Amino acid sequence: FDETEIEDFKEAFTVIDQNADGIIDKDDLRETFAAMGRLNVKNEELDAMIKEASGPINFTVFLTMFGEKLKGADPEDVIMGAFKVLDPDGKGSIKKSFLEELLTTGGGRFTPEEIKNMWAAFPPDVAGNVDYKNICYVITHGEDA
Amino acid sequence: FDETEIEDFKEAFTVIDQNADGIIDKDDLRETFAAMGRLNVKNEELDAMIKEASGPINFTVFLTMFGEKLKGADPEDVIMGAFKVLDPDGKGSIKKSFLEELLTTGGGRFTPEEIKNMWAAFPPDVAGNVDYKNICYVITHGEDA
Amino acid sequence: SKAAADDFKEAFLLFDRTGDAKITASQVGDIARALGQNPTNAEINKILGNPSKEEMNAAAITFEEFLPMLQAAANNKDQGTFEDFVEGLRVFDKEGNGTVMGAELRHVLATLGEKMTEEEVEELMKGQEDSNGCINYEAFVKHIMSV
16 A cells, blocks of 8 residues: 555545544445435445444544455556566557466466456457556546546 | 754654653653554564663654764755756656666765665666656655655 | 875775775776876776786776876876867867867767767767857867866
8 A cells, every 4th residue: 555545545535424523434425425426325235335344434444444355456557567568669559369378377367267357348458458558547446437 | 954854853743742741751652653543552662762762752862863863864855956957858757777877887875786775665767767756755755655 | 295195095985886995997097087187098008008907807906006007197297288279179160269060079079089978078068069059169178177
């Protein structure tokens, strides 16, 4: 965890903790979702978020919960560092079959089935290994941009 | 020591001296660490901080201890002054090999091995000598931002 | 002689990167220049070889060899006459005003005789040549003899 990433989680903690007392309760979760447009947010969704913690969601409990789910989270500059080492001549997005062979043949984390899931929402270019950069974006901030 | 840097150390001395009597004892160290989230701060860490002084930690003993550890501490504006003289055309971060050659070939403090340690937590850009500015930040205030 | 100038020994401690009080034979040319002596690089080369000293293989030094080599180079400082430096450049460009066109002095200083790198040539013209492309060598040779 770099310090600017921890400051981003402190700002997200303050936007969900609308009572500003330092502990995100279930009313803060529901009022942050209602301010984003969720008028139908069920109480069972709020209870499942609180069921991931053993205590009240203060800043260090929110940081430890996000730490334990993001144990391989990598910032965009280090993902582009590794993709610039995979394309060491610069500019070009690397081939689809080169990333499939190098993921498998180096590591067990790069096994195929997982490579079909990589191509599956990370579209073609991304999946193929040709573009580059959009995948670093969606690994640090999810969903389609 | 510029006067605003001495006022920053006076404010840090007042935040660690929670009894407000002018001398930081071991109870102040432990209660400042517990207010930052350190519930497991051992007494041997507090004793090693007090073992760096010959007397009680008043404001002038804290300033002389920090002076003797920071005998080459440079503010961010003077580090950016020197990096603007290394990049005299402005804007561009300077090359990796140019900073390695100019550190070595001018001074003994710029010898290589030390240059590998500079690249080692000061990442690539920083290490390489291309970016600039993030290294001035972390030299005045440590750890990843 | 001492006049025993002990600051030559203190400057040898600023050029020795290992702190063992020895200076390699490849640094001796530039350190004679930093002590106030301008021997040409062929002269520094000859003297070395003259004494069956090879600058091609690893070298170390001792102060006891560097001191007499600086004292053998110190007699040759009578060759530094500024009349001939300004008259050299006065024969290098027409008309009665001391101006070399930029690229004439840069290509002559890099390729004629003892090769100076174009990085060092740009560092010696920086400030004395403005955007007209004309180097005034009356002030240029004055500032080169100020160091």
